[PDB]
Design an enzyme around this catalytic site. Sequence first.
Site, PDB file in Angstrom:
ATOM      1  CE  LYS A  36     101.616 -52.523   4.107  1.00  0.00           C
ATOM      2  NZ  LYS A  36     100.205 -51.773   3.607  1.00  0.00           N
ATOM      3  CG  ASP A  64      98.667 -54.072   1.565  1.00  0.00           C
ATOM      4  OD1 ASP A  64      98.007 -54.868   1.054  1.00  0.00           O
ATOM      5  OD2 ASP A  64      98.726 -53.593   2.638  1.00  0.00           O
ATOM      6  CE  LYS A  66      95.325 -56.259   3.196  1.00  0.00           C
ATOM      7  NZ  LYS A  66      96.047 -55.196   3.302  1.00  0.00           N
ATOM      8  CB  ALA A  68      89.549 -59.429  -2.841  1.00  0.00           C
ATOM      9  CB  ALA A 178      99.251 -48.545  15.353  1.00  0.00           C
ATOM     10  CG  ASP A 182     107.573 -57.287  21.163  1.00  0.00           C
ATOM     11  OD1 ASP A 182     107.501 -56.108  21.458  1.00  0.00           O
ATOM     12  OD2 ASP A 182     108.586 -58.047  20.542  1.00  0.00           O
ATOM     13  N   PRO A 183     108.127 -56.076  17.455  1.00  0.00           N
ATOM     14  CG  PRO A 183     108.895 -54.047  17.301  1.00  0.00           C
ATOM     15  CD  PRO A 183     107.832 -54.632  18.155  1.00  0.00           C
ATOM     16  N   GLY A 196     103.516 -49.099   9.928  1.00  0.00           N
ATOM     17  CA  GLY A 196     103.055 -47.520   9.399  1.00  0.00           C
ATOM     18  C   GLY A 196     102.999 -46.615  10.465  1.00  0.00           C
TER      19      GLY A 196
HETATM   20  O1  LIG Z   1      96.506 -58.021   8.197  1.00  0.00           O
HETATM   21  C1  LIG Z   1      96.814 -56.901   7.899  1.00  0.00           C
HETATM   22  C2  LIG Z   1      96.610 -55.798   8.675  1.00  0.00           C
HETATM   23  N1  LIG Z   1      97.439 -54.732   8.022  1.00  0.00           N
HETATM   24  N2  LIG Z   1      97.588 -54.706   6.996  1.00  0.00           N
HETATM   25  C3  LIG Z   1      98.019 -53.090   6.378  1.00  0.00           C
HETATM   26  O2  LIG Z   1      99.599 -53.059   7.055  1.00  0.00           O
HETATM   27  C4  LIG Z   1      99.577 -51.735   7.492  1.00  0.00           C
HETATM   28  C5  LIG Z   1      99.397 -51.641   9.084  1.00  0.00           C
HETATM   29  O3  LIG Z   1      99.824 -50.254   9.399  1.00  0.00           O
HETATM   30  P1  LIG Z   1     100.152 -49.808  10.928  1.00  0.00           P
HETATM   31  O4  LIG Z   1     101.249 -50.285  11.495  1.00  0.00           O
HETATM   32  O5  LIG Z   1      99.854 -48.548  11.032  1.00  0.00           O
HETATM   33  O6  LIG Z   1      98.899 -50.461  11.518  1.00  0.00           O
HETATM   34  C6  LIG Z   1      98.203 -50.800   6.915  1.00  0.00           C
HETATM   35  O7  LIG Z   1      98.758 -50.448   5.597  1.00  0.00           O
HETATM   36  C7  LIG Z   1      97.399 -52.190   6.763  1.00  0.00           C
HETATM   37  O8  LIG Z   1      96.298 -51.710   5.735  1.00  0.00           O
HETATM   38  C8  LIG Z   1      97.687 -55.555   6.034  1.00  0.00           C
HETATM   39  O9  LIG Z   1      98.114 -55.272   4.933  1.00  0.00           O
HETATM   40  N3  LIG Z   1      97.380 -56.552   6.676  1.00  0.00           N
END
Ligand SMILES: O=c1cnn([C@@H]2O[C@H](COP(=O)(O)O)[C@@H](O)[C@H]2O)c(=O)[nH]1
Lengths: 220, 219
Positions: A36, A64, A66, A68, A178, A182-183, A196
């Site tokens: 992503k 990704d 978003k 909008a 982060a 949980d996976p 991420g």
């Molecule tokens: O509802 C959400 C929450 N996070 N993300 C995206 O998913 C990743 C989450 O990364 P992380 O594992 O470092 O938190 C980031 O690119 C964040 O913008 C989404 O797309 N939607």
Amino acid sequence: DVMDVMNRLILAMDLMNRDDALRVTGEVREYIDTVKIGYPLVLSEGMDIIAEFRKRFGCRIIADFKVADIPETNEKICRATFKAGADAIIVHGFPGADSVRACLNVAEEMGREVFLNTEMSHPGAEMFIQGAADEIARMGVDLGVKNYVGPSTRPERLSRLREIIGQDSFLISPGVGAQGGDPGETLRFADAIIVGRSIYLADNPAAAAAGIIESIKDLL
Amino acid sequence: VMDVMNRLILAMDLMNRDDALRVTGEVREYIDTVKIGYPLVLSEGMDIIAEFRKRFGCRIIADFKVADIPETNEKICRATFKAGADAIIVHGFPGADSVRACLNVAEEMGREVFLNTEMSHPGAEMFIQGAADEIARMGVDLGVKNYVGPSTRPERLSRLREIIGQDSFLISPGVGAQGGDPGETLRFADAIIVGRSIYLADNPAAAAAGIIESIKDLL
Ligand SMILES: O=c1cnn([C@@H]2O[C@H](COP(=O)(O)O)[C@@H](O)[C@H]2O)c(=O)[nH]1
Ligand SMILES: O=c1cnn([C@@H]2O[C@H](COP(=O)(O)O)[C@@H](O)[C@H]2O)c(=O)[nH]1
């Protein structure tokens, strides 16, 4: 006929430096085939980074972004994104059906997929998004959307989303690691988890990825 | 607040660098404020901001509809301001933390945030309109000073102006192609955003001049 994500694990590559992004993705390449890419990397290094990832890794790319905006602008964003080689794009549902349809049209024209973000995973999602989320999911179903995004941080909400869209639809889920998700619990409902920072900020990203996969090995 | 020449902001959504530069150059005597969004940025790169600054005496508003989680919003704002944008437009529907993240970066970096409260297209009726008054009130509580609201719904634009007060800055798209009227919109908005009515015109300069003539008593 859905996307087949290796190890049910999608790397969220939000490093903002080309060298680091390529190095870290390279370190975990044996574990994934889907990346992503979002605006942090694209706005820092350019849309050409997408083609470079395909050249180096052959991985599937989900943009990704978003999406909008109004329909006519959404159409342009999708066209530019798919021209850059993205396989799929993530679009918000909050702006309504016409805005989603604009994205679906371009995706169908270019052989790509649209993912509908139904409920975000951060605390602020409770204010406006959560109350609209089931309706946004039903809107996706009405529009023929087959790919969805929902929150690892709220497995009961992720479960409801899965209920609405059915077992045939494809569901991916960020907020793992982060943000507290949980996976294994997330994979009760989602087809794939997005990860991420837990991976890309790890001292050893390969070990981090391997560890996550080990924890879900029974889930394949 | 930013001093927008002729109360008119060009929405430069052409996707080709040559065309975008040509059209912007043609209307430069009428404007000093350009809104650049993802259609152009994703086609030509963030260096298009640098190019516009070099070629024109224009402030740049990055219309990126920022709509992610706080940590990602922060990164988007940092990258956007680093590239030279004066301001960025963000969504409020992802909630207060997501907006605050953008405000924090803008404060640290000496730039501005605009909050989009209600979009101008028909689909906005489904979810956005019902949240719009609260999103605007949230903006006020968070200290947001700059707002975007819809030309296509004068009554909604009027309500949003009430919520944010006369001291806040309000810009409004949906003029021209989407049906909004320049003069009526300027009853409530400080400036109007105009894209296609100008950039698809055979003579963009004449199109801009015509819009300005129609609102001359409001300038
Ligand atoms: O509802 C959400 C929450 N996070 N993300 C995206 O998913 C990743 C989450 O990364 P992380 O594992 O470092 O938190 C980031 O690119 C964040 O913008 C989404 O797309 N939607
Ligand atoms: O609620 C809205 C509606 N439109 N726009 C943006 O303003 C411009 C409207 O252009 P137009 O004059 O060609 O319709 C486009 O860039 C569109 O993405 C917004 O930011 N918010």
